[PDB]
Amino acid sequence: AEVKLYGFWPSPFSHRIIWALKLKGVEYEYIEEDLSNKSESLLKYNPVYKKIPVLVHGDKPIAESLVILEYIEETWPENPLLPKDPYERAMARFWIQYGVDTVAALRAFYLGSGEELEKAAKELSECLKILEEQGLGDKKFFGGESMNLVDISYGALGYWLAAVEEAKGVTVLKPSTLPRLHAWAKNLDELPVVKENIPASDKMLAYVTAAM
Numbered sequence: 001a002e003v004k005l006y007g008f009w010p011s012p013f014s015h016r017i018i019w020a021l022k023l024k025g026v027e028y029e030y031i032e033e034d035l036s037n038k039s040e041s042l043l044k045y046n047p048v049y050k051k052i053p054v055l056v057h058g059d060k061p062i063a064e065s066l067v068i069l070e071y072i073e074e075t076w077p078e079n080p081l082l083p084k085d086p087y088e089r090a091m092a093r094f095w096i097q098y099g100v101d102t103v104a105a106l107r108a109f110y111l112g113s114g115e116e117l118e119k120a121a122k123e124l125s126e127c128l129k130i131l132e133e134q135g136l137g138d139k140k141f142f143g144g145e146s147m148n149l150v151d152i153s154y155g156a157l158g159y160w161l162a163a164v165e166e167a168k169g170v171t172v173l174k175p176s177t178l179p180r181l182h183a184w185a186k187n188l189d190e191l192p193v194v195k196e197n198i199p200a201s202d203k204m205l206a207y208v209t210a211a212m
């Protein structure tokens with residue numbers, strides 16, 4: 001109500017927006033899209049990309065999850081998900097942009113097989129070690145003592161990557177090699193705002209498996 005969210009159930013890109021809206025207490029109408037039979041509404045609201053998610057606020061559409069998250073932060077500023085200091089805001093945006101590199105590494109791992117899969121697993125691990133060492137550090141959350149937009153952007157490193165790891169038979173994010181990032185991902189997975197708003201583990205696995 002007031003806000004509509006066009007999504008796809010198994011997509012972390014959609015889950016990101018749900019978490020942000022719940023952290024802001026904003027009520028929304030969720031519309032599930034069939035990506036092989038896209039609604040007329042989705043095609044009208046996101047003509048450029050024809051992708052979910054799309055947030056519609058008072059009949060005006062915002063596409064692209066990272067753009068939507070910034071819009072939510074600016075439109076409902078209470079309970080900030082970005083810091084005030086411009087430098088710390090720039091560091092948040094920097095690590096969100098590093099998410100592009102992370103998604104690419106996740107994608108190569110997702111698609112890898114044989115000695116390719118072992119390559120991509122090693123490269124994903126190296127990508128995550130940089131994120132852990134230079135991004136997260138010794139903080140409980142990327143946002144410090146509470147989640148910020150960076151935590152939301154990387155939350156898929158828990159439930160989603162875990163499902164992919166199971167399907168692939170290879171675990172990359174593990175406590176022995178990434179103790180701080182693994183603890184972060186586990187803690188985020190156990191947070192009610194996340195745990196209540198991701199698919200059941202069995203459904204998530206079933207999905208990634210199929211996709212493969």
Ligand SMILES: N[C@@H](CCC(=O)N[C@@H](CS)C(=O)NCC(=O)O)C(=O)O
Pocket residue numbers: 008011012013035050051052053063064065066
């Ligand atoms: N950069 C976009 C990516 C979103 C995206 O890739 N959405 C996929 C589903 S996870 C999609 O809608 N694909 C349309 C299609 O399958 O043709 C974002 O962050 O919102």
